[PDB]
Design an enzyme around this catalytic site. Sequence first.
Site, PDB file in Angstrom:
ATOM      1  N   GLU A   7       1.091  -1.593   0.414  1.00  0.00           N
ATOM      2  CA  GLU A   7      -0.111  -0.203  -0.067  1.00  0.00           C
ATOM      3  C   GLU A   7       0.980   1.216   0.251  1.00  0.00           C
ATOM      4  O   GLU A   7       0.616   2.302  -0.743  1.00  0.00           O
ATOM      5  CB  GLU A   7      -0.504   0.399   1.268  1.00  0.00           C
ATOM      6  CG  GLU A   7      -2.730  -0.448   1.089  1.00  0.00           C
ATOM      7  CD  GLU A   7      -3.009  -0.627   2.117  1.00  0.00           C
ATOM      8  OE1 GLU A   7      -3.123  -0.866   3.167  1.00  0.00           O
ATOM      9  OE2 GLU A   7      -3.825   0.451   2.488  1.00  0.00           O
TER      10      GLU A   7
ATOM     11  N   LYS B  66     -11.364   5.584   1.272  1.00  0.00           N
ATOM     12  CA  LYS B  66     -10.277   4.267   0.359  1.00  0.00           C
ATOM     13  C   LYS B  66     -11.679   3.835  -0.421  1.00  0.00           C
ATOM     14  O   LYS B  66     -11.815   3.180  -0.240  1.00  0.00           O
ATOM     15  CB  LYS B  66      -9.306   3.603   1.098  1.00  0.00           C
ATOM     16  CG  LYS B  66      -8.425   4.175   2.191  1.00  0.00           C
ATOM     17  CD  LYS B  66      -7.641   2.606   2.771  1.00  0.00           C
ATOM     18  CE  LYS B  66      -6.624   3.050   3.601  1.00  0.00           C
ATOM     19  NZ  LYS B  66      -6.052   1.923   3.693  1.00  0.00           N
TER      20      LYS B  66
HETATM   21  N1  LIG Z   1     -10.043   0.537  11.182  1.00  0.00           N
HETATM   22  C1  LIG Z   1      -8.766   0.629   9.350  1.00  0.00           C
HETATM   23  N2  LIG Z   1      -8.988   1.800   9.099  1.00  0.00           N
HETATM   24  C2  LIG Z   1      -7.207   2.307   8.723  1.00  0.00           C
HETATM   25  O1  LIG Z   1      -6.629   3.028   8.521  1.00  0.00           O
HETATM   26  C3  LIG Z   1      -6.729   0.779   7.774  1.00  0.00           C
HETATM   27 BR1  LIG Z   1      -5.410  -0.028   6.682  1.00  0.00          BR
HETATM   28  C4  LIG Z   1      -7.690  -0.541   7.815  1.00  0.00           C
HETATM   29  C5  LIG Z   1      -6.981  -1.962   7.910  1.00  0.00           C
HETATM   30  C6  LIG Z   1      -6.076  -2.269   8.341  1.00  0.00           C
HETATM   31  C7  LIG Z   1      -5.129  -3.586   7.336  1.00  0.00           C
HETATM   32  C8  LIG Z   1      -6.270  -4.341   6.301  1.00  0.00           C
HETATM   33  C9  LIG Z   1      -7.832  -3.839   6.774  1.00  0.00           C
HETATM   34  C10 LIG Z   1      -7.959  -2.667   6.447  1.00  0.00           C
HETATM   35  N3  LIG Z   1      -8.219  -0.869   9.349  1.00  0.00           N
END
Ligand SMILES: Nc1nc(O)c(Br)c(-c2ccccc2)n1
Lengths: 121, 121, 121, 121, 121, 121, 121, 121
Positions: free
Chosen positions: F22, F100
Amino acid sequence: MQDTIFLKGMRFYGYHGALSAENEIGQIFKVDVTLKVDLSEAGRTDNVIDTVHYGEVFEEVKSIMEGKAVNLLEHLAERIANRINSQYNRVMETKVRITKENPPIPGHYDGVGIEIVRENK
Amino acid sequence: MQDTIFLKGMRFYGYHGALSAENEIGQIFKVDVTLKVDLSEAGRTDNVIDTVHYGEVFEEVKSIMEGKAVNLLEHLAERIANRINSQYNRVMETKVRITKENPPIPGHYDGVGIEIVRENK
Amino acid sequence: MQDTIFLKGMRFYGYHGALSAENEIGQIFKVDVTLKVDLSEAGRTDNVIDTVHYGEVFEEVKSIMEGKAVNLLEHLAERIANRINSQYNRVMETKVRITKENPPIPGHYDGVGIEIVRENK
Amino acid sequence: MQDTIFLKGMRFYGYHGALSAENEIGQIFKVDVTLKVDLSEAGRTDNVIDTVHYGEVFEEVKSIMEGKAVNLLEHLAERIANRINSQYNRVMETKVRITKENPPIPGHYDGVGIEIVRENK
Amino acid sequence: MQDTIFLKGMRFYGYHGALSAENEIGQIFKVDVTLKVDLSEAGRTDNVIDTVHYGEVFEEVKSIMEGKAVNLLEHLAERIANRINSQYNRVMETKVRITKENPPIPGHYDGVGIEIVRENK
Amino acid sequence: MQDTIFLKGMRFYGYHGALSAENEIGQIFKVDVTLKVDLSEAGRTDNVIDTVHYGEVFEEVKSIMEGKAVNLLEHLAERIANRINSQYNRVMETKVRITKENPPIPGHYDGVGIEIVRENK
Amino acid sequence: MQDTIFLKGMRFYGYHGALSAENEIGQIFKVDVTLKVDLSEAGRTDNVIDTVHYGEVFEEVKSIMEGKAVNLLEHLAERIANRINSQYNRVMETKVRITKENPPIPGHYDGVGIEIVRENK
Amino acid sequence: MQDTIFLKGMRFYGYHGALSAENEIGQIFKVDVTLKVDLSEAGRTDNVIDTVHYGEVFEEVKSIMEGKAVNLLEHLAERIANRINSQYNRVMETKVRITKENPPIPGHYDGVGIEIVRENK
Ligand SMILES: Nc1nc(O)c(Br)c(-c2ccccc2)n1
Ligand SMILES: Nc1nc(O)c(Br)c(-c2ccccc2)n1
Ligand SMILES: Nc1nc(O)c(Br)c(-c2ccccc2)n1
Ligand SMILES: Nc1nc(O)c(Br)c(-c2ccccc2)n1
Ligand SMILES: Nc1nc(O)c(Br)c(-c2ccccc2)n1
Ligand SMILES: Nc1nc(O)c(Br)c(-c2ccccc2)n1
Ligand SMILES: Nc1nc(O)c(Br)c(-c2ccccc2)n1
Ligand SMILES: Nc1nc(O)c(Br)c(-c2ccccc2)n1
């Protein structure tokens, strides 16, 4: 001659389809009809009688799209192309695009369909 | 020569139409204007004087779309195509697409319309 | 209790309106119907008989939206809210949003409308 | 009382803004107006005289949005909220949302704006 | 040969325009770039070295769209078409469509622009 | 007090995310910022000094969204909410929605995200 | 506490429905899931372990939306709300909105559905 | 012969791409497939056996789009064009448009992609 009269995204709920379930439940069929017609006389005269009346065309399409259920979209577009050419001599050619945005197809897509172009004889 | 200058989805509230009620109430007419013009000199020079000024074109379209109410969209596009060709020698050809997204047609569609292409003589 | 059953963007071609021309030509009326209904028993049972059937609701709305032409959208939503509450005891409350995306209003907007919320007594 | 009369996405080309260039060139201002009004009498009567006429409201908004250029969107919404409340006693409250979808802001966004809610006294 | 590599709706905030105010405030320019390139070897090989790398193309477009402010969109598309052809022999031809969705034009439209097609010599 | 100043759908290309890949490649983060601010004085005065300047807010958001890459969207919205409250006393409260639309999630969805509301102390 | 973690417009092709034909052919079910969760610790820490992981939530929803075919959307949302609350203590409450954009309903609408809100005990 | 059978905006989550990170995380690939096929016999007969079955085509596309991860979109479209031509003699030609709406490209665009047209031999 690139002049055209069009009817975009016409939508009808019908029961066409090759699958039994399809005909039972039904679905929305999207239709795009574009006719090749010389529009300069109508552009000069402003008389609705020197061009092709789209309201009447919508009726023709509607009556076929909302009538007896057939199998193929190919059969629906052919019935439409042949019905518009027959009734209007000004239509040098007829293009019919039929879209099944929600067919019984397991997947994610915007739609499936066919498109035919039939010149008037 | 495939260069073009365009004006997309221009919208005007006008009173054109072949039905009395249409002219009374009025509606929104969508307009797409694409002009065939050689843009290499303007691309080389960067001088707005070596190309066609679209602001002026929008004014021409607007004045016709928002002026006296006529019958056909064919008459509106012809008046527009003929007004742009006359005033601009650089426009080798003019295409006018006029759409009635909400005509007095009992149905569900995205819109109906006409489209003309008129070369400049 | 925040549970709801909804019908979004239902569209009908009708002849309502306070202007004569409006009733003659007609137009598309967009309808949003949201019903306050406890859905936990239906969520537990999975029996369509422990909840409110939306197909039937669409029919109720349709029959009013596509029936006799009235003046106000206020009258259409009130007839709808009162028709859904009367026939369904499970509907603790009914909200009806009616939109005229293309009214006889000289301008550029996405739409005009009204919205009512009527609890079931 | 949750009844409302609304005008969505009204669009006007105006010259408001705190930057000189803004007032010179101008831009499109999007406007959303929602009025708190009891619509049950109008829903019962069907008489346009028992409710608030939106056409008139659009005119009020238009005249302010397309009139003398001011600085803030806050000033435009306040002039609108205060103009609708003053002229209509049936409007228990007025909410005005004004959006600048294309302000002189170096970036990628859908729009910026303000929103006010003003009860009628 | 109808193969193509494309970059759609690229958006940049720049200060181009023939009006002083335009260059001061700036605006978003939409860009569509379509390149005529034979993709069968890349389709057979799967090697990124037998085709044209779009990331690099986006950089070329970006650097011009976000660089020194010019007058015409004709000048921007010509600089782009000439920069892609020069650096890539595989690009048999380059088409650049530039759109000003929000120009200093008093009206309601979806956008104005130009489009050029330049073969590689 | 229901007055608000908003910035909708701001978009930034950043490298935040809890997955290594990412942070390497990056992606577009959509941001919605709504501030609770009393706008009646600004509505009365028309002076940009009696309200909160959104351009400055966009800069604050941008600098955080396009700066050092963090893990959570929760951390980005908290940094933003805390940065707007600190610098502006007129902001009684700050709401930050971060989306996102294209996360590393095998599926078909419109987007995933978080939203926080932080009052100013 | 107004903090939330959301998953918008998730789409799955499933065979749920109270009509035989529905289960045979199948259709696309749209899902919106919003979870009430305190995000300040995660906003302070930036540690993915102080918040709820949405990827895992999407999996939970997916497995139910794409699993054994049931009757009601009420049963699907209840299974989802109850599955997210059970596995996550941080989720103070779960809201599930399920939409059938293309049900076996003869008409023109944007969609029909249900929505439930279930607090975590 | 301008007849066509089409599949629009098919979407698949796959791991193709020339960058390591790309293959790890993955992304959504949009696919448009248009086949040149004579549809008059099917239009006359209505027999699904006189035309090409799109469900089968979607399966062919899906299996390639969701299978082993390759480098280029050029390789994916070539595998698809070559797989549809081989299995269907009625397809006089196959056009495949593949779009990466969210590639690892730092910028704001609607998407990047390639398009090939391959006649059946
Ligand atoms: N709640 C939350 N906030 C974020 O900013 C992320 Br990146 C994730 C996350 C982390 C790992 C896998 C999927 C989602 N989860
Ligand atoms: N070409 C074509 N035209 C139609 O109208 C249908 Br229905 C089908 C079809 C038949 C069975 C399964 C999938 C698609 N195929
Ligand atoms: N071809 C064409 N062009 C127009 O501009 C109009 Br209005 C009509 C028309 C006339 C009467 C009824 C329906 C359509 N038809
Ligand atoms: N409030 C309201 N509800 C309706 O249904 C109509 Br039609 C009108 C109206 C009447 C005349 C002119 C403009 C709007 N106004
Ligand atoms: N709050 C607010 N309301 C308005 O109407 C304007 Br214009 C501005 C503003 C002023 C200068 C720069 C950026 C925004 N700010
Ligand atoms: N053809 C063309 N290309 C451009 O790039 C511009 Br800016 C203008 C133009 C110039 C002045 C007023 C309106 C449009 N016209
Ligand atoms: N409330 C509700 N929830 C569902 O999930 C379905 Br399927 C139906 C339903 C059942 C039969 C006909 C129309 C709708 N109704
Ligand atoms: N032409 C083309 N086709 C593809 O499928 C890819 Br992935 C790339 C590419 C490779 C590296 C960086 C950017 C784009 N370029």
